[PDB]
PDB file of all heavy atoms in Angstrom:
ATOM      1  N   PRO A 118      -2.283 -29.086   7.189  1.00 73.55           N
ATOM      2  CA  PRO A 118      -3.594 -29.663   7.505  1.00 73.55           C
ATOM      3  C   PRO A 118      -4.314 -28.984   8.677  1.00 73.55           C
ATOM      4  O   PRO A 118      -5.496 -29.240   8.895  1.00 73.55           O
ATOM      5  CB  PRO A 118      -3.261 -31.118   7.837  1.00 73.55           C
ATOM      6  CG  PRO A 118      -1.882 -31.081   8.348  1.00 73.55           C
ATOM      7  CD  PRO A 118      -1.183 -29.930   7.691  1.00 73.55           C
ATOM      8  N   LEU A 150      -6.542 -36.823   8.642  1.00 63.15           N
ATOM      9  CA  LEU A 150      -5.564 -37.396   7.709  1.00 63.15           C
ATOM     10  C   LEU A 150      -6.003 -38.737   7.126  1.00 63.15           C
ATOM     11  O   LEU A 150      -5.495 -39.167   6.086  1.00 63.15           O
ATOM     12  CB  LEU A 150      -4.197 -37.540   8.382  1.00 63.15           C
ATOM     13  CG  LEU A 150      -3.517 -36.271   8.906  1.00 63.15           C
ATOM     14  CD1 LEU A 150      -2.362 -36.633   9.827  1.00 63.15           C
ATOM     15  CD2 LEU A 150      -3.048 -35.376   7.764  1.00 63.15           C
ATOM     16  N   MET A 156      -8.499 -35.357   1.912  1.00 62.27           N
ATOM     17  CA  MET A 156      -7.087 -35.198   1.575  1.00 62.27           C
ATOM     18  C   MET A 156      -6.897 -34.933   0.082  1.00 62.27           C
ATOM     19  O   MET A 156      -6.187 -34.001  -0.296  1.00 62.27           O
ATOM     20  CB  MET A 156      -6.287 -36.432   2.003  1.00 62.27           C
ATOM     21  CG  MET A 156      -6.202 -36.639   3.512  1.00 62.27           C
ATOM     22  SD  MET A 156      -4.743 -35.919   4.298  1.00 62.27           S
ATOM     23  CE  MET A 156      -3.478 -37.082   3.774  1.00 62.27           C
ATOM     24  N   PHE A 179       3.313 -23.820   2.879  1.00 58.53           N
ATOM     25  CA  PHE A 179       2.135 -24.644   3.148  1.00 58.53           C
ATOM     26  C   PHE A 179       1.846 -24.843   4.644  1.00 58.53           C
ATOM     27  O   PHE A 179       0.902 -25.539   5.013  1.00 58.53           O
ATOM     28  CB  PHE A 179       2.177 -25.976   2.380  1.00 58.53           C
ATOM     29  CG  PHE A 179       3.440 -26.766   2.571  1.00 58.53           C
ATOM     30  CD1 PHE A 179       3.566 -27.654   3.639  1.00 58.53           C
ATOM     31  CD2 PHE A 179       4.493 -26.651   1.666  1.00 58.53           C
ATOM     32  CE1 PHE A 179       4.731 -28.406   3.816  1.00 58.53           C
ATOM     33  CE2 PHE A 179       5.660 -27.394   1.833  1.00 58.53           C
ATOM     34  CZ  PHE A 179       5.781 -28.275   2.911  1.00 58.53           C
ATOM     35  N   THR A 181       1.564 -26.188   7.880  1.00 56.61           N
ATOM     36  CA  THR A 181       1.538 -27.432   8.676  1.00 56.61           C
ATOM     37  C   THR A 181       1.779 -27.237  10.177  1.00 56.61           C
ATOM     38  O   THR A 181       2.309 -28.121  10.848  1.00 56.61           O
ATOM     39  CB  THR A 181       2.462 -28.573   8.110  1.00 56.61           C
ATOM     40  OG1 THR A 181       3.844 -28.223   8.260  1.00 56.61           O
ATOM     41  CG2 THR A 181       2.159 -28.866   6.650  1.00 56.61           C
ATOM     42  N   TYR A 184      -1.330 -28.853  14.684  1.00 59.23           N
ATOM     43  CA  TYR A 184      -2.342 -29.829  14.273  1.00 59.23           C
ATOM     44  C   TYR A 184      -3.399 -30.018  15.358  1.00 59.23           C
ATOM     45  O   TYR A 184      -3.068 -30.208  16.526  1.00 59.23           O
ATOM     46  CB  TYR A 184      -1.692 -31.176  13.937  1.00 59.23           C
ATOM     47  CG  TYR A 184      -2.630 -32.179  13.292  1.00 59.23           C
ATOM     48  CD1 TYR A 184      -2.713 -32.291  11.904  1.00 59.23           C
ATOM     49  CD2 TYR A 184      -3.426 -33.021  14.069  1.00 59.23           C
ATOM     50  CE1 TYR A 184      -3.574 -33.212  11.304  1.00 59.23           C
ATOM     51  CE2 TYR A 184      -4.293 -33.939  13.483  1.00 59.23           C
ATOM     52  CZ  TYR A 184      -4.361 -34.031  12.101  1.00 59.23           C
ATOM     53  OH  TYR A 184      -5.215 -34.943  11.518  1.00 59.23           O
ATOM     54  N   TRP A 194       0.572 -32.948  18.189  1.00 55.41           N
ATOM     55  CA  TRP A 194       1.670 -33.826  17.801  1.00 55.41           C
ATOM     56  C   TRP A 194       1.746 -35.032  18.715  1.00 55.41           C
ATOM     57  O   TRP A 194       2.030 -36.142  18.267  1.00 55.41           O
ATOM     58  CB  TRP A 194       2.996 -33.065  17.779  1.00 55.41           C
ATOM     59  CG  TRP A 194       2.896 -31.799  16.996  1.00 55.41           C
ATOM     60  CD1 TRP A 194       2.993 -30.528  17.477  1.00 55.41           C
ATOM     61  CD2 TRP A 194       2.630 -31.683  15.597  1.00 55.41           C
ATOM     62  NE1 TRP A 194       2.819 -29.623  16.461  1.00 55.41           N
ATOM     63  CE2 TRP A 194       2.593 -30.306  15.294  1.00 55.41           C
ATOM     64  CE3 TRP A 194       2.427 -32.607  14.568  1.00 55.41           C
ATOM     65  CZ2 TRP A 194       2.359 -29.830  14.002  1.00 55.41           C
ATOM     66  CZ3 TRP A 194       2.190 -32.137  13.288  1.00 55.41           C
ATOM     67  CH2 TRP A 194       2.159 -30.758  13.016  1.00 55.41           C
ATOM     68  N   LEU A 197      -1.010 -37.320  17.561  1.00 57.21           N
ATOM     69  CA  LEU A 197      -0.663 -37.998  16.310  1.00 57.21           C
ATOM     70  C   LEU A 197       0.228 -39.208  16.564  1.00 57.21           C
ATOM     71  O   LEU A 197      -0.021 -40.288  16.017  1.00 57.21           O
ATOM     72  CB  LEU A 197      -0.004 -37.035  15.320  1.00 57.21           C
ATOM     73  CG  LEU A 197      -0.933 -36.060  14.591  1.00 57.21           C
ATOM     74  CD1 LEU A 197      -0.129 -34.995  13.878  1.00 57.21           C
ATOM     75  CD2 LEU A 197      -1.853 -36.783  13.609  1.00 57.21           C
ATOM     76  N   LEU A 202      -0.463 -41.739  13.734  1.00 56.31           N
ATOM     77  CA  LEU A 202      -0.837 -41.014  12.521  1.00 56.31           C
ATOM     78  C   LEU A 202       0.182 -39.932  12.154  1.00 56.31           C
ATOM     79  O   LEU A 202      -0.054 -39.128  11.243  1.00 56.31           O
ATOM     80  CB  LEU A 202      -2.233 -40.405  12.673  1.00 56.31           C
ATOM     81  CG  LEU A 202      -3.403 -41.385  12.772  1.00 56.31           C
ATOM     82  CD1 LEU A 202      -4.599 -40.736  13.457  1.00 56.31           C
ATOM     83  CD2 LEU A 202      -3.778 -41.908  11.396  1.00 56.31           C
ATOM     84  N   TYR A 203       1.312 -39.926  12.859  1.00 53.51           N
ATOM     85  CA  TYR A 203       2.369 -38.945  12.626  1.00 53.51           C
ATOM     86  C   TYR A 203       3.131 -39.217  11.328  1.00 53.51           C
ATOM     87  O   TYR A 203       3.518 -38.283  10.623  1.00 53.51           O
ATOM     88  CB  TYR A 203       3.323 -38.893  13.820  1.00 53.51           C
ATOM     89  CG  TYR A 203       4.376 -37.817  13.722  1.00 53.51           C
ATOM     90  CD1 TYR A 203       4.032 -36.468  13.776  1.00 53.51           C
ATOM     91  CD2 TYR A 203       5.721 -38.149  13.583  1.00 53.51           C
ATOM     92  CE1 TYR A 203       5.005 -35.477  13.688  1.00 53.51           C
ATOM     93  CE2 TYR A 203       6.701 -37.168  13.499  1.00 53.51           C
ATOM     94  CZ  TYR A 203       6.335 -35.838  13.551  1.00 53.51           C
ATOM     95  OH  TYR A 203       7.303 -34.872  13.463  1.00 53.51           O
ATOM     96  N   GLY A 204       3.344 -40.496  11.023  1.00 55.80           N
ATOM     97  CA  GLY A 204       3.921 -40.908   9.746  1.00 55.80           C
ATOM     98  C   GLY A 204       3.015 -40.527   8.590  1.00 55.80           C
ATOM     99  O   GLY A 204       3.484 -40.163   7.507  1.00 55.80           O
ATOM    100  N   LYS A 205       1.710 -40.602   8.839  1.00 58.54           N
ATOM    101  CA  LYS A 205       0.700 -40.218   7.865  1.00 58.54           C
ATOM    102  C   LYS A 205       0.668 -38.701   7.672  1.00 58.54           C
ATOM    103  O   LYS A 205       0.247 -38.217   6.622  1.00 58.54           O
ATOM    104  CB  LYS A 205      -0.669 -40.747   8.295  1.00 58.54           C
ATOM    105  CG  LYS A 205      -1.561 -41.172   7.142  1.00 58.54           C
ATOM    106  CD  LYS A 205      -2.467 -42.329   7.545  1.00 58.54           C
ATOM    107  CE  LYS A 205      -3.235 -42.852   6.895  1.00 58.54           C
ATOM    108  NZ  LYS A 205      -4.521 -43.214   7.494  1.00 58.54           N
ATOM    109  N   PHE A 206       1.115 -37.963   8.692  1.00 61.26           N
ATOM    110  CA  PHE A 206       1.253 -36.506   8.607  1.00 61.26           C
ATOM    111  C   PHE A 206       2.470 -36.108   7.776  1.00 61.26           C
ATOM    112  O   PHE A 206       2.389 -35.192   6.956  1.00 61.26           O
ATOM    113  CB  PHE A 206       1.322 -35.856  10.004  1.00 61.26           C
ATOM    114  CG  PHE A 206       1.850 -34.440   9.988  1.00 61.26           C
ATOM    115  CD1 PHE A 206       1.013 -33.372   9.679  1.00 61.26           C
ATOM    116  CD2 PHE A 206       3.191 -34.180  10.257  1.00 61.26           C
ATOM    117  CE1 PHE A 206       1.500 -32.070   9.645  1.00 61.26           C
ATOM    118  CE2 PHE A 206       3.687 -32.879  10.221  1.00 61.26           C
ATOM    119  CZ  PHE A 206       2.839 -31.825   9.914  1.00 61.26           C
ATOM    120  N   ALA A 207       3.594 -36.786   8.007  1.00 61.66           N
ATOM    121  CA  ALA A 207       4.831 -36.537   7.264  1.00 61.66           C
ATOM    122  C   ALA A 207       4.642 -36.845   5.785  1.00 61.66           C
ATOM    123  O   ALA A 207       5.152 -36.132   4.922  1.00 61.66           O
ATOM    124  CB  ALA A 207       5.964 -37.369   7.828  1.00 61.66           C
ATOM    125  N   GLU A 208       3.900 -37.917   5.517  1.00 60.72           N
ATOM    126  CA  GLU A 208       3.545 -38.344   4.170  1.00 60.72           C
ATOM    127  C   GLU A 208       2.743 -37.259   3.446  1.00 60.72           C
ATOM    128  O   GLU A 208       2.923 -37.043   2.243  1.00 60.72           O
ATOM    129  CB  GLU A 208       2.755 -39.653   4.260  1.00 60.72           C
ATOM    130  CG  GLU A 208       2.199 -40.202   2.951  1.00 60.72           C
ATOM    131  CD  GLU A 208       1.204 -41.340   3.176  1.00 60.72           C
ATOM    132  OE1 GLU A 208       1.480 -42.227   4.018  1.00 60.72           O
ATOM    133  OE2 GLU A 208       0.141 -41.338   2.516  1.00 60.72           O
ATOM    134  N   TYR A 209       1.873 -36.574   4.189  1.00 59.64           N
ATOM    135  CA  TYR A 209       1.078 -35.475   3.646  1.00 59.64           C
ATOM    136  C   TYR A 209       1.924 -34.224   3.382  1.00 59.64           C
ATOM    137  O   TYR A 209       1.743 -33.549   2.367  1.00 59.64           O
ATOM    138  CB  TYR A 209      -0.109 -35.145   4.564  1.00 59.64           C
ATOM    139  CG  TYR A 209      -0.880 -33.915   4.134  1.00 59.64           C
ATOM    140  CD1 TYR A 209      -1.695 -33.938   3.000  1.00 59.64           C
ATOM    141  CD2 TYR A 209      -0.780 -32.721   4.849  1.00 59.64           C
ATOM    142  CE1 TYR A 209      -2.393 -32.805   2.596  1.00 59.64           C
ATOM    143  CE2 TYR A 209      -1.475 -31.585   4.452  1.00 59.64           C
ATOM    144  CZ  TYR A 209      -2.277 -31.634   3.327  1.00 59.64           C
ATOM    145  OH  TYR A 209      -2.967 -30.513   2.929  1.00 59.64           O
ATOM    146  N   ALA A 210       2.839 -33.922   4.298  1.00 58.65           N
ATOM    147  CA  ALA A 210       3.705 -32.755   4.174  1.00 58.65           C
ATOM    148  C   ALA A 210       4.727 -32.934   3.052  1.00 58.65           C
ATOM    149  O   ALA A 210       4.991 -32.002   2.288  1.00 58.65           O
ATOM    150  CB  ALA A 210       4.398 -32.458   5.498  1.00 58.65           C
ATOM    151  N   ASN A 211       5.288 -34.139   2.953  1.00 59.86           N
ATOM    152  CA  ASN A 211       6.241 -34.471   1.896  1.00 59.86           C
ATOM    153  C   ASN A 211       5.619 -34.361   0.509  1.00 59.86           C
ATOM    154  O   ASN A 211       6.293 -33.968  -0.452  1.00 59.86           O
ATOM    155  CB  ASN A 211       6.832 -35.868   2.111  1.00 59.86           C
ATOM    156  CG  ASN A 211       7.731 -35.947   3.341  1.00 59.86           C
ATOM    157  OD1 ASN A 211       8.256 -34.939   3.813  1.00 59.86           O
ATOM    158  ND2 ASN A 211       7.913 -37.155   3.859  1.00 59.86           N
ATOM    159  N   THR A 212       4.332 -34.703   0.421  1.00 61.81           N
ATOM    160  CA  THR A 212       3.556 -34.549  -0.805  1.00 61.81           C
ATOM    161  C   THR A 212       3.514 -33.075  -1.214  1.00 61.81           C
ATOM    162  O   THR A 212       3.847 -32.742  -2.350  1.00 61.81           O
ATOM    163  CB  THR A 212       2.120 -35.124  -0.648  1.00 61.81           C
ATOM    164  OG1 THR A 212       2.192 -36.512  -0.298  1.00 61.81           O
ATOM    165  CG2 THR A 212       1.320 -34.979  -1.940  1.00 61.81           C
ATOM    166  N   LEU A 213       3.139 -32.205  -0.273  1.00 63.37           N
ATOM    167  CA  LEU A 213       3.068 -30.759  -0.513  1.00 63.37           C
ATOM    168  C   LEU A 213       4.433 -30.141  -0.830  1.00 63.37           C
ATOM    169  O   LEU A 213       4.516 -29.142  -1.549  1.00 63.37           O
ATOM    170  CB  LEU A 213       2.448 -30.031   0.684  1.00 63.37           C
ATOM    171  CG  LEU A 213       1.038 -30.382   1.168  1.00 63.37           C
ATOM    172  CD1 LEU A 213       0.673 -29.499   2.349  1.00 63.37           C
ATOM    173  CD2 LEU A 213       0.005 -30.244   0.059  1.00 63.37           C
ATOM    174  N   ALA A 214       5.490 -30.731  -0.279  1.00 66.39           N
ATOM    175  CA  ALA A 214       6.855 -30.300  -0.559  1.00 66.39           C
ATOM    176  C   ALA A 214       7.249 -30.672  -1.986  1.00 66.39           C
ATOM    177  O   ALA A 214       7.836 -29.863  -2.702  1.00 66.39           O
ATOM    178  CB  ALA A 214       7.821 -30.909   0.437  1.00 66.39           C
ATOM    179  N   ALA A 215       6.908 -31.894  -2.391  1.00 64.81           N
ATOM    180  CA  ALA A 215       7.199 -32.384  -3.738  1.00 64.81           C
ATOM    181  C   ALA A 215       6.350 -31.672  -4.785  1.00 64.81           C
ATOM    182  O   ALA A 215       6.840 -31.346  -5.867  1.00 64.81           O
ATOM    183  CB  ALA A 215       6.986 -33.888  -3.816  1.00 64.81           C
ATOM    184  N   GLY A 230       5.652 -29.486  13.092  1.00 90.72           N
ATOM    185  CA  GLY A 230       5.489 -30.900  12.778  1.00 90.72           C
ATOM    186  C   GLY A 230       6.722 -31.633  12.303  1.00 90.72           C
ATOM    187  O   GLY A 230       6.673 -32.844  12.092  1.00 90.72           O
ATOM    188  N   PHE A 231       7.827 -30.911  12.140  1.00 94.86           N
ATOM    189  CA  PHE A 231       9.067 -31.505  11.647  1.00 94.86           C
ATOM    190  C   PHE A 231       9.914 -32.110  12.763  1.00 94.86           C
ATOM    191  O   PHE A 231      10.353 -31.406  13.678  1.00 94.86           O
ATOM    192  CB  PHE A 231       9.867 -30.483  10.837  1.00 94.86           C
ATOM    193  CG  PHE A 231       9.337 -30.271   9.449  1.00 94.86           C
ATOM    194  CD1 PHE A 231       8.230 -29.457   9.228  1.00 94.86           C
ATOM    195  CD2 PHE A 231       9.935 -30.899   8.361  1.00 94.86           C
ATOM    196  CE1 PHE A 231       7.731 -29.267   7.944  1.00 94.86           C
ATOM    197  CE2 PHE A 231       9.446 -30.715   7.072  1.00 94.86           C
ATOM    198  CZ  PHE A 231       8.342 -29.896   6.863  1.00 94.86           C
ATOM    199  N   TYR A 232      10.129 -33.423  12.665  1.00 96.99           N
ATOM    200  CA  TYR A 232      10.915 -34.206  13.627  1.00 96.99           C
ATOM    201  C   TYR A 232      10.590 -33.867  15.082  1.00 96.99           C
ATOM    202  O   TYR A 232      11.475 -33.563  15.885  1.00 96.99           O
ATOM    203  CB  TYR A 232      12.419 -34.093  13.329  1.00 96.99           C
ATOM    204  CG  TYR A 232      12.795 -34.665  11.981  1.00 96.99           C
ATOM    205  CD1 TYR A 232      12.947 -33.840  10.868  1.00 96.99           C
ATOM    206  CD2 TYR A 232      12.984 -36.035  11.813  1.00 96.99           C
ATOM    207  CE1 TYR A 232      13.283 -34.363   9.627  1.00 96.99           C
ATOM    208  CE2 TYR A 232      13.318 -36.567  10.577  1.00 96.99           C
ATOM    209  CZ  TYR A 232      13.467 -35.727   9.488  1.00 96.99           C
ATOM    210  OH  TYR A 232      13.802 -36.252   8.261  1.00 96.99           O
ATOM    211  N   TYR A 233       9.300 -33.937  15.396  1.00 95.87           N
ATOM    212  CA  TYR A 233       8.776 -33.598  16.710  1.00 95.87           C
ATOM    213  C   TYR A 233       9.475 -34.374  17.820  1.00 95.87           C
ATOM    214  O   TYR A 233       9.560 -35.605  17.773  1.00 95.87           O
ATOM    215  CB  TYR A 233       7.269 -33.850  16.748  1.00 95.87           C
ATOM    216  CG  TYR A 233       6.618 -33.565  18.081  1.00 95.87           C
ATOM    217  CD1 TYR A 233       6.315 -32.261  18.465  1.00 95.87           C
ATOM    218  CD2 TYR A 233       6.295 -34.603  18.955  1.00 95.87           C
ATOM    219  CE1 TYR A 233       5.708 -31.998  19.688  1.00 95.87           C
ATOM    220  CE2 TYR A 233       5.693 -34.352  20.178  1.00 95.87           C
ATOM    221  CZ  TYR A 233       5.402 -33.046  20.539  1.00 95.87           C
ATOM    222  OH  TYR A 233       4.807 -32.786  21.751  1.00 95.87           O
ATOM    223  N   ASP A 238      12.153 -41.347  13.768  1.00102.77           N
ATOM    224  CA  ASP A 238      11.475 -42.587  13.397  1.00102.77           C
ATOM    225  C   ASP A 238      10.628 -42.365  12.143  1.00102.77           C
ATOM    226  O   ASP A 238      10.361 -43.300  11.387  1.00102.77           O
ATOM    227  CB  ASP A 238      10.628 -43.140  14.556  1.00102.77           C
ATOM    228  CG  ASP A 238       9.790 -42.068  15.256  1.00102.77           C
ATOM    229  OD1 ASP A 238       9.442 -41.042  14.628  1.00102.77           O
ATOM    230  OD2 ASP A 238       9.470 -42.265  16.448  1.00102.77           O
ATOM    231  N   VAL A 239      10.215 -41.116  11.937  1.00 99.14           N
ATOM    232  CA  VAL A 239       9.506 -40.707  10.727  1.00 99.14           C
ATOM    233  C   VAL A 239      10.294 -39.590  10.035  1.00 99.14           C
ATOM    234  O   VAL A 239      10.566 -38.551  10.639  1.00 99.14           O
ATOM    235  CB  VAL A 239       8.068 -40.225  11.040  1.00 99.14           C
ATOM    236  CG1 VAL A 239       7.340 -39.873   9.763  1.00 99.14           C
ATOM    237  CG2 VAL A 239       7.293 -41.283  11.816  1.00 99.14           C
ATOM    238  N   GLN A 240      10.650 -39.813   8.772  1.00 97.87           N
ATOM    239  CA  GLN A 240      11.484 -38.877   8.006  1.00 97.87           C
ATOM    240  C   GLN A 240      10.678 -37.816   7.246  1.00 97.87           C
ATOM    241  O   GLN A 240       9.526 -38.038   6.869  1.00 97.87           O
ATOM    242  CB  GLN A 240      12.412 -39.641   7.044  1.00 97.87           C
ATOM    243  CG  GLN A 240      13.557 -40.400   7.729  1.00 97.87           C
ATOM    244  CD  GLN A 240      14.767 -39.515   8.039  1.00 97.87           C
ATOM    245  OE1 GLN A 240      15.559 -39.192   7.150  1.00 97.87           O
ATOM    246  NE2 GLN A 240      14.922 -39.139   9.305  1.00 97.87           N
ATOM    247  N   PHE A 241      11.301 -36.662   7.031  1.00 96.57           N
ATOM    248  CA  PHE A 241      10.681 -35.555   6.307  1.00 96.57           C
ATOM    249  C   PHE A 241      11.576 -35.091   5.158  1.00 96.57           C
ATOM    250  O   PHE A 241      12.789 -35.312   5.175  1.00 96.57           O
ATOM    251  CB  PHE A 241      10.414 -34.374   7.248  1.00 96.57           C
ATOM    252  CG  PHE A 241       9.364 -34.638   8.291  1.00 96.57           C
ATOM    253  CD1 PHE A 241       9.658 -35.392   9.424  1.00 96.57           C
ATOM    254  CD2 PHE A 241       8.089 -34.113   8.155  1.00 96.57           C
ATOM    255  CE1 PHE A 241       8.695 -35.631  10.390  1.00 96.57           C
ATOM    256  CE2 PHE A 241       7.120 -34.343   9.120  1.00 96.57           C
ATOM    257  CZ  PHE A 241       7.426 -35.108  10.238  1.00 96.57           C
ATOM    258  N   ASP A 242      10.958 -34.448   4.168  1.00 94.84           N
ATOM    259  CA  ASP A 242      11.659 -33.851   3.034  1.00 94.84           C
ATOM    260  C   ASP A 242      12.667 -32.819   3.534  1.00 94.84           C
ATOM    261  O   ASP A 242      12.331 -31.956   4.348  1.00 94.84           O
ATOM    262  CB  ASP A 242      10.645 -33.197   2.090  1.00 94.84           C
ATOM    263  CG  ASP A 242      11.250 -32.790   0.760  1.00 94.84           C
ATOM    264  OD1 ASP A 242      12.137 -31.913   0.735  1.00 94.84           O
ATOM    265  OD2 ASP A 242      10.816 -33.338  -0.274  1.00 94.84           O
ATOM    266  N   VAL A 245      12.744 -28.559   2.405  1.00 93.10           N
ATOM    267  CA  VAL A 245      11.764 -27.620   2.942  1.00 93.10           C
ATOM    268  C   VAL A 245      12.462 -26.534   3.757  1.00 93.10           C
ATOM    269  O   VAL A 245      13.182 -26.830   4.713  1.00 93.10           O
ATOM    270  CB  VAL A 245      10.700 -28.344   3.813  1.00 93.10           C
ATOM    271  CG1 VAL A 245       9.635 -27.368   4.299  1.00 93.10           C
ATOM    272  CG2 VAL A 245      10.060 -29.488   3.043  1.00 93.10           C
ATOM    273  N   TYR A 270      18.426 -28.770   7.480  1.00 79.42           N
ATOM    274  CA  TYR A 270      17.471 -27.695   7.219  1.00 79.42           C
ATOM    275  C   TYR A 270      18.080 -26.302   7.301  1.00 79.42           C
ATOM    276  O   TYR A 270      18.897 -26.018   8.176  1.00 79.42           O
ATOM    277  CB  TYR A 270      16.273 -27.782   8.169  1.00 79.42           C
ATOM    278  CG  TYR A 270      15.320 -28.912   7.858  1.00 79.42           C
ATOM    279  CD1 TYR A 270      15.205 -30.005   8.714  1.00 79.42           C
ATOM    280  CD2 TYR A 270      14.534 -28.890   6.709  1.00 79.42           C
ATOM    281  CE1 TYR A 270      14.334 -31.046   8.434  1.00 79.42           C
ATOM    282  CE2 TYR A 270      13.659 -29.923   6.419  1.00 79.42           C
ATOM    283  CZ  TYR A 270      13.563 -30.998   7.284  1.00 79.42           C
ATOM    284  OH  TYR A 270      12.697 -32.027   7.001  1.00 79.42           O
TER     285      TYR A 270
END
Side-chain angles (χ1 to χ4, degrees):
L150 300 166
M156 293 267 286
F179 53 87
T181 69
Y184 189 94
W194 310 114
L197 283 168
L202 293 157
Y203 185 67
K205 215 148 180 221
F206 164 82
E208 175 191 316
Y209 174 72
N211 292 338
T212 301
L213 301 181
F231 282 79
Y232 297 98
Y233 178 79
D238 45 26
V239 183
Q240 289 277 283
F241 293 78
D242 191 296
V245 183
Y270 287 111

